[PDB]
Coordinates of C-alpha atoms and ligand atoms in Angstrom, one line a residue:
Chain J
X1 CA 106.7 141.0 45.2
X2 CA 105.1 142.7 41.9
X3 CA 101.8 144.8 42.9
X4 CA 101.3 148.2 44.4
X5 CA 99.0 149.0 46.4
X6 CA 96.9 152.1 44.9
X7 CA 94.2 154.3 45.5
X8 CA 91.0 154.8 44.4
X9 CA 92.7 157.1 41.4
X10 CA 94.7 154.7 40.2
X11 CA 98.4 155.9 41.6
X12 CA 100.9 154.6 43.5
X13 CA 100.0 154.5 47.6
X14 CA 102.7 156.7 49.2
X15 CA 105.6 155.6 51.5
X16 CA 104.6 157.6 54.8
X17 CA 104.4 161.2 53.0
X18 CA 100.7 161.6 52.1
X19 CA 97.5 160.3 54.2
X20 CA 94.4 158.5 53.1
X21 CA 91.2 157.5 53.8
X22 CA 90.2 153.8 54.6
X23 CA 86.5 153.7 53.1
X24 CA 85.1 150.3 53.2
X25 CA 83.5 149.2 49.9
X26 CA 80.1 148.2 51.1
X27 CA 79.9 150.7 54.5
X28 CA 81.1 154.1 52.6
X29 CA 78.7 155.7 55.0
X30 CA 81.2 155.0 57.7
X31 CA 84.4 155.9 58.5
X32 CA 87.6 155.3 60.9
X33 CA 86.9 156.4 64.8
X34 CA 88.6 155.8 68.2
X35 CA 86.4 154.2 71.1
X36 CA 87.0 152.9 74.4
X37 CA 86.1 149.4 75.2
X38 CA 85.1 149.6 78.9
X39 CA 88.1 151.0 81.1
X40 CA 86.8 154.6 80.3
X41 CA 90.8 156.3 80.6
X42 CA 91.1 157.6 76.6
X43 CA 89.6 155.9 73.6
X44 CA 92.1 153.9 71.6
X45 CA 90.8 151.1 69.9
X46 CA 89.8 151.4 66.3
X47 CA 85.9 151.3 65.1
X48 CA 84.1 151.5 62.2
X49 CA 81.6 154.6 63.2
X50 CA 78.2 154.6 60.9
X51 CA 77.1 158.3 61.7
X52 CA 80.7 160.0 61.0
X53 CA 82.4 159.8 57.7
X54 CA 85.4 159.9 56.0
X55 CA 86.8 159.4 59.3
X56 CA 90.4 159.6 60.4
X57 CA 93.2 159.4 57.8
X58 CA 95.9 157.1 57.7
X59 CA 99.7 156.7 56.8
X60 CA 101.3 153.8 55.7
X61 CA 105.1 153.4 56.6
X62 CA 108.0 151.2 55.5
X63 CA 111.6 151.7 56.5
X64 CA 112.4 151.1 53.4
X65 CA 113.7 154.6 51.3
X66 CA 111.2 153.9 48.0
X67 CA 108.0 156.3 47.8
X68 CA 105.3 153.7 47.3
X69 CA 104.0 150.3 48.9
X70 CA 103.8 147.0 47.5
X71 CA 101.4 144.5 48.9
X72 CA 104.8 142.3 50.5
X73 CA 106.3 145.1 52.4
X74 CA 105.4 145.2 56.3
X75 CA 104.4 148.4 57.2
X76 CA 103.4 150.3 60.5
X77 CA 99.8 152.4 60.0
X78 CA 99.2 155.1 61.7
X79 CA 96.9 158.3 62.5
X80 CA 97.8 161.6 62.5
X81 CA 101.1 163.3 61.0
X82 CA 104.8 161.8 59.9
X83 CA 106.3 163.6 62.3
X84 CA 104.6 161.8 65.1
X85 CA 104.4 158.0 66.9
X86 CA 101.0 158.7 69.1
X87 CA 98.3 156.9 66.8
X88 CA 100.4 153.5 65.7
X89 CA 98.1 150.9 65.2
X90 CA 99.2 147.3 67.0
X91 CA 96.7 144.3 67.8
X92 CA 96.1 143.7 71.6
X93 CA 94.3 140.5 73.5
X94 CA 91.6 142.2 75.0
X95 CA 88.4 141.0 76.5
X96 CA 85.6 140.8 75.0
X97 CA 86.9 141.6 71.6
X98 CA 89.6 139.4 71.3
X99 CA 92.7 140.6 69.3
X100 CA 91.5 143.7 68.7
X101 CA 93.3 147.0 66.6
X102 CA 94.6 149.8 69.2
X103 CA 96.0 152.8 68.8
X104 CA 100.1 153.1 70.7
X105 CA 102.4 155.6 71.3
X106 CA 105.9 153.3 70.0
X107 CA 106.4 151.6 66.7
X108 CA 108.7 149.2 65.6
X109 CA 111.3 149.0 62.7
X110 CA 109.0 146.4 60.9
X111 CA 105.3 147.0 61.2
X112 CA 103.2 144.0 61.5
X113 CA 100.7 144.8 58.7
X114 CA 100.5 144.2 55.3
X115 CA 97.9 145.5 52.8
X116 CA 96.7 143.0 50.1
X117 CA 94.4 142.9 47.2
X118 CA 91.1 141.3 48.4
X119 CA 87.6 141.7 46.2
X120 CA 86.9 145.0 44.6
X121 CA 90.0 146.7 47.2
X122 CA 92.5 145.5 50.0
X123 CA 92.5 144.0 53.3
X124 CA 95.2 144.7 56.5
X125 CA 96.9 141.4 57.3
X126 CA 98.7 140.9 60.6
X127 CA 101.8 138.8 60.6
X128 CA 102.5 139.3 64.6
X129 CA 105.9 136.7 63.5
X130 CA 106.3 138.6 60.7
X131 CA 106.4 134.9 59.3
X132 CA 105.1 133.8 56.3
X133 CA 101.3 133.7 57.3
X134 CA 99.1 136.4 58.5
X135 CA 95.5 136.9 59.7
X136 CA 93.2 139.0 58.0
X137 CA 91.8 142.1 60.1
X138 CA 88.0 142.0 60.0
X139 CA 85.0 143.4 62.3
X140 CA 83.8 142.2 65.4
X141 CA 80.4 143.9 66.8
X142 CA 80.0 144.7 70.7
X143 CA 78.7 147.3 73.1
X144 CA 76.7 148.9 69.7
X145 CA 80.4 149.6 68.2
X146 CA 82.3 147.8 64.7
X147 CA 85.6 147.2 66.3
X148 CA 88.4 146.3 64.3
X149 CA 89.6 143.1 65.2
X150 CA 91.3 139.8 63.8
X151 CA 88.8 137.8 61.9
X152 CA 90.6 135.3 60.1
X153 CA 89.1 134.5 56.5
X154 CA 86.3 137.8 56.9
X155 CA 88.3 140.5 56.3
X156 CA 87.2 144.0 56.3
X157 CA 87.9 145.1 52.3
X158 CA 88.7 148.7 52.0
X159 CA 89.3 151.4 49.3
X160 CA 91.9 153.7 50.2
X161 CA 91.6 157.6 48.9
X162 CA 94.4 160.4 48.9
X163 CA 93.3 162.5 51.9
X164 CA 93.8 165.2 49.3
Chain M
X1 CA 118.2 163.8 50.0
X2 CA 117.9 165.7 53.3
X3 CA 119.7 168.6 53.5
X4 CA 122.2 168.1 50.3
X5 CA 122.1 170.5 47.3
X6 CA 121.7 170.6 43.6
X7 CA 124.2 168.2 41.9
X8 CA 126.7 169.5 39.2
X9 CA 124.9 168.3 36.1
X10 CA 126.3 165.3 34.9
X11 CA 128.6 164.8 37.7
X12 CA 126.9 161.4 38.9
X13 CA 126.9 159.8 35.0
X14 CA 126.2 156.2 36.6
X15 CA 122.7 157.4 38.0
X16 CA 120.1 155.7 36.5
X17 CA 116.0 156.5 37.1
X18 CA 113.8 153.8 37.8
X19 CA 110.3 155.5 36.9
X20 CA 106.4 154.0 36.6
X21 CA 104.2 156.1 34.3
X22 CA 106.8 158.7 34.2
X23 CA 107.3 159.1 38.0
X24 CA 110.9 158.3 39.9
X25 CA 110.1 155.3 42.4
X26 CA 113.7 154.2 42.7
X27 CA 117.4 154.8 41.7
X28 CA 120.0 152.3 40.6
X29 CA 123.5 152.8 39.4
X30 CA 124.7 151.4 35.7
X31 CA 127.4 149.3 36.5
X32 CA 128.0 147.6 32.7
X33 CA 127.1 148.5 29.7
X34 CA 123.4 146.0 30.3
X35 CA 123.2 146.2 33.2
X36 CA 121.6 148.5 36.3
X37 CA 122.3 147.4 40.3
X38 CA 119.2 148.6 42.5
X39 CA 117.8 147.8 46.1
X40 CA 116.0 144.3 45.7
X41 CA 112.9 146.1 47.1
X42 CA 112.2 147.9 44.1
X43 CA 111.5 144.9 42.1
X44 CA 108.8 145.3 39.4
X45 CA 108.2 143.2 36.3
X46 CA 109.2 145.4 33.9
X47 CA 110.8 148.8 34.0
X48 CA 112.0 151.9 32.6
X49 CA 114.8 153.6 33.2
X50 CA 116.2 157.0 32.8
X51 CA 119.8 157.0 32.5
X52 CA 121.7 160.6 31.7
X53 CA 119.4 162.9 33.7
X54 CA 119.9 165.9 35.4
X55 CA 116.1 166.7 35.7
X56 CA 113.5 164.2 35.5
X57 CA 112.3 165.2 32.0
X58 CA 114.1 163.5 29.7
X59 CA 112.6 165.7 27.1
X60 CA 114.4 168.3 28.1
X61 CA 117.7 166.1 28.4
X62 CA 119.8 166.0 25.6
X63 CA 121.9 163.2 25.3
X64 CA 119.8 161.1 28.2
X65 CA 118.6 157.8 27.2
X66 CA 114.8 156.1 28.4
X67 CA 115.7 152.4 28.0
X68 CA 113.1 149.4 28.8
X69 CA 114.0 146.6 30.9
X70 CA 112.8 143.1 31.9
X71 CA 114.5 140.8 33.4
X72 CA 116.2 141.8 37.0
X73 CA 117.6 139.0 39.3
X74 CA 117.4 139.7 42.9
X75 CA 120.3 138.6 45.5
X76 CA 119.2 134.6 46.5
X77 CA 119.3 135.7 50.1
X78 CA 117.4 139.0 49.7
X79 CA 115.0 139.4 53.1
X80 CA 116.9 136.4 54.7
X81 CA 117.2 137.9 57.5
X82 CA 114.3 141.0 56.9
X83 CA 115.6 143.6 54.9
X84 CA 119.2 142.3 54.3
X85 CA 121.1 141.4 51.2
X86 CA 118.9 144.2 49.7
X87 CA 120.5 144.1 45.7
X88 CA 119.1 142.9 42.6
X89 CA 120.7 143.4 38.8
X90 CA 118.5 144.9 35.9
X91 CA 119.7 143.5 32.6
X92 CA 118.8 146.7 30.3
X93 CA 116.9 145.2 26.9
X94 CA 119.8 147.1 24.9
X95 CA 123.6 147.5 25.9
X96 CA 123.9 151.5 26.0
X97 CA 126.6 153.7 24.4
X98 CA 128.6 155.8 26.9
X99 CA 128.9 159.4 26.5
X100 CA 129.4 162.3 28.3
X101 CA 126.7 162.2 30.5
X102 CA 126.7 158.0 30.7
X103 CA 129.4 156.4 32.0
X104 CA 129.6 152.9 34.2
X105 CA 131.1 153.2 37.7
X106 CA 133.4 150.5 39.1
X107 CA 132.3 149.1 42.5
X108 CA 134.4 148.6 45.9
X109 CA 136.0 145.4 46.3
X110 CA 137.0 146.5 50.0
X111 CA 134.3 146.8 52.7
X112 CA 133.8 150.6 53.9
X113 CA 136.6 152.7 57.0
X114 CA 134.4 154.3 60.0
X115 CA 134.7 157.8 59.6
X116 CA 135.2 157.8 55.3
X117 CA 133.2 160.6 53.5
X118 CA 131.1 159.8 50.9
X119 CA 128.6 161.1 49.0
X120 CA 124.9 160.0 48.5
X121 CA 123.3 161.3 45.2
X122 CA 119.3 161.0 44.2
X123 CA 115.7 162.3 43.6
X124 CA 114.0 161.6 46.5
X125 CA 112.3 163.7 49.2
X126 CA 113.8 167.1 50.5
X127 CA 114.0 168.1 54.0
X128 CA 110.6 170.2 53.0
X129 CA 108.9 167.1 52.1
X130 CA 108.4 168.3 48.5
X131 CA 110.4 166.5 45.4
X132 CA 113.3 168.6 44.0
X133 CA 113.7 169.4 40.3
X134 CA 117.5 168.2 39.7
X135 CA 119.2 165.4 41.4
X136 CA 120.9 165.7 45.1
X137 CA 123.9 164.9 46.6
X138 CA 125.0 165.2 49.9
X139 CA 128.4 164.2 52.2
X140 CA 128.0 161.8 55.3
X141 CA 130.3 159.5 57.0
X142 CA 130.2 156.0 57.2
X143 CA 129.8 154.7 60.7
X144 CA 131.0 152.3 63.1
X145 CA 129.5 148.7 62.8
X146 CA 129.6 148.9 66.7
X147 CA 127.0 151.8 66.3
X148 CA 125.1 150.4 63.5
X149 CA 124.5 147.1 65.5
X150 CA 123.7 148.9 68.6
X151 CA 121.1 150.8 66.7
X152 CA 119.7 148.4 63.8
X153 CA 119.9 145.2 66.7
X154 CA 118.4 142.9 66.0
X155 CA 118.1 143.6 62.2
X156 CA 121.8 144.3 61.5
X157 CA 123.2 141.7 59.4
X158 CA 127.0 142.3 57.7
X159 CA 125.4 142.8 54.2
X160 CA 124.3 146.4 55.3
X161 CA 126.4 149.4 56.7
X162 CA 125.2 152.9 58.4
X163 CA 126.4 156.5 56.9
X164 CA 125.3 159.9 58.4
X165 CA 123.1 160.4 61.4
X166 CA 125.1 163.5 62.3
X167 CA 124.0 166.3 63.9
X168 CA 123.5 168.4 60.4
X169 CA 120.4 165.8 59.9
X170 CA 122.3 164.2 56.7
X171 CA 120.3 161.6 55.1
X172 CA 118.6 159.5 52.2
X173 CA 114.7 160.3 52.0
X174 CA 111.5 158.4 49.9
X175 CA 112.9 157.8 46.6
X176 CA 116.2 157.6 47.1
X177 CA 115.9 153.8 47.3
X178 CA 118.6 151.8 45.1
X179 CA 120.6 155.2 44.3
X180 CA 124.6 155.3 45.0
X181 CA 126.9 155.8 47.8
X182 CA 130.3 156.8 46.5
X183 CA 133.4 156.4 48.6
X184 CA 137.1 157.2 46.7
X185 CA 135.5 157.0 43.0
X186 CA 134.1 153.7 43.7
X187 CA 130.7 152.3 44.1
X188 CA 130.8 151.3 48.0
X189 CA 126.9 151.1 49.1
X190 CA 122.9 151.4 47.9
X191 CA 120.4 153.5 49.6
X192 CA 118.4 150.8 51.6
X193 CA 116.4 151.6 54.5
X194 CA 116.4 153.4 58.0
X195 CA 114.2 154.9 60.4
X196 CA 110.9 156.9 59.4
X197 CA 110.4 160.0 59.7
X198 CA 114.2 160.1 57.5
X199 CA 116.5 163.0 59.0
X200 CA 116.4 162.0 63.0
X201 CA 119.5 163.6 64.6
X202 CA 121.6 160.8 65.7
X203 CA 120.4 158.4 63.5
X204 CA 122.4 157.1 60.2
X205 CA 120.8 155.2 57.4
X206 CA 121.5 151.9 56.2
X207 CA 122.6 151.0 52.8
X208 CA 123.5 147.9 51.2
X209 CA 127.1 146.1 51.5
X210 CA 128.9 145.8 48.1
X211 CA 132.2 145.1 48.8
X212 CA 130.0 141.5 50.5
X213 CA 128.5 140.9 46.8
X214 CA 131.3 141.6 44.0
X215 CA 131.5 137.5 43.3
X216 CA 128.0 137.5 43.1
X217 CA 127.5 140.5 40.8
X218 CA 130.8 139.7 38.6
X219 CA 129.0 135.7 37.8
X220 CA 125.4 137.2 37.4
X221 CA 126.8 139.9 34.6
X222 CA 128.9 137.3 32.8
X223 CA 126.2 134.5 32.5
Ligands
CL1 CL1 86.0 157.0 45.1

């Protein structure tokens, strides 16, 4: 596929070395957070927190040796640094949210995401097949928190800025 | 290139630089006169291509040549399985002159020997995560397809071999994407893929088949 994903300064989205920001295009005024969703233990689902901004940085990783990402490459996202596998973002079945985005400690070969352009920025895609058709990864509201969740056809459109 | 060093200028004349807004995405390797072989996952719709570098500044490069490109033809079967068959031929808009520091290679027509050195050359990513001034090359072995498969299972398909994983962390970084591996003065492999971070001891990266594709690349040159 043609198009690169890029950031809000017009360059090339790096291939797992550099970390960005996912600021949503309408909700700037909140940013990425980890919550629980009942079973106290450690948060690890992903929210969109009003009160705390820019939030949590993320990589995007293909196995693929090239130092950008196009909008067709599957890709693992994750928190924290390159060197490590603890904030891996998969989609878990989980009551009441439904499929909703957690953080996990393994990652495989092929991510499930894609990033695609959507609107003024991009949307994350899941392709749990990693078939030919994805669902778009949108917001679903419970317990007073913005969880991120699969919402096919209302996607959650995002700008991504260089950490930087 | 993880843990390689410095080329000798000129040394790798068939390296060619696949760059957007003058910065290196890719490699590929000039294999004709017109033509450029690269990983099918650097497609773009148009290109430019660096082909006589040493550094990336071509300014600063006498006798390199910045040639456009549009048209590239991606292997039929490319990502059928997921991330196999990973080749695709650039047809350069201007046949180039060879020279000193230009030259085609010839590829393998024989698939690769476990336990063969070869050498991987490019511009990606050091083992410092920064981007090195002058093109890399580095030494790693081509491994077993027993290991390969165990590893890459279920994603190993016979258009892909592994090379390094040794114990000195050899390997192909970001960037180093469509570049050559070199076995006996021939053309034997492409930098493809692998596991992320790059450099894990104990794991070799994966690089495209050659030896599976010379019909294919002989009949797409000649029509
Ligand atoms: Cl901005």
């Amino acid at each position: 596929g043609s198009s690169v994903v890029v950031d809000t300064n017009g360059q090339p989205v790096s291939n797992g070395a550099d970390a960005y920001y996912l600021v949503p295009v309408s909700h700037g005024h909140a940013g990425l957070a980890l919550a629980k969703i009942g079973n106290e233990a450690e948060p690890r689902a992903v929210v969109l927190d009003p009160h705390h901004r820019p939030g949590l940085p993320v990589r995007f990783e293909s196995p693929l040796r090239i130092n950008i990402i196009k909008e067709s490459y599957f890709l693992n996202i994750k928190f924290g640094p390159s060197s490590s596998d603890s904030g891996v973002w998969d989609v878990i079945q989980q009551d009441p949210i439904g499929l909703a985005v957690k953080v996990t400690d393994t990652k495989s070969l092929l991510g499930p995401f894609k990033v695609e352009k959507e609107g003024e920025g991009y949307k994350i895609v899941y392709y749990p097949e990693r078939g030919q058709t994805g669902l778009d990864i949108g917001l679903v509201h419970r317990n007073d928190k913005y969880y991120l969740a699969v919402k096919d056809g209302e996607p959650c459109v995002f700008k991504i800025r260089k950490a930087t | 290139i993880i843990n390689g060093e410095d080329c000798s200028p000129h040394s790798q004349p068939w390296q060619a630089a696949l760059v957007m807004e003058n910065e290196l995405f890719c490699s590929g390797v000039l294999v004709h006169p017109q033509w450029v072989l690269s990983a099918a996952h650097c497609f773009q719709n148009s290109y430019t291509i660096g082909l006589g570098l040493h550094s990336l500044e071509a300014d600063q490069e006498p006798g390199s040549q910045m040639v456009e490109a549009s048209l590239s033809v991606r292997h039929p079967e490319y990502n059928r399985p997921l991330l196999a068959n990973d080749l695709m031929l650039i047809k350069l808009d201007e046949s180039v002159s060879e020279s000193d520091t230009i030259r085609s290679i010839s590829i393998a027509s024989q698939c690769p020997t476990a336990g063969n050195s070869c050498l991987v050359s490019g511009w990606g990513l050091l083992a410092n995560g920064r981007m090195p001034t002058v093109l890399q090359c580095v030494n790693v072995s081509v491994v077993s397809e027993e290991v390969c498969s165990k590893l890459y299972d279920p994603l190993y398909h016979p258009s892909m071999f592994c090379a390094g994983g040794g114990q000195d962390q050899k390997d192909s970084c970001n960037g180093d994407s469509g570049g050559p591996l070199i076995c006996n003065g021939y053309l034997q492999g492409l930098v493809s893929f692998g596991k992320a971070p790059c450099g894990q001891v104990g794991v070799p990266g994966v690089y495209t088949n050659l030896c599976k594709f010379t019909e294919w690349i002989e009949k797409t040159v000649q029509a």
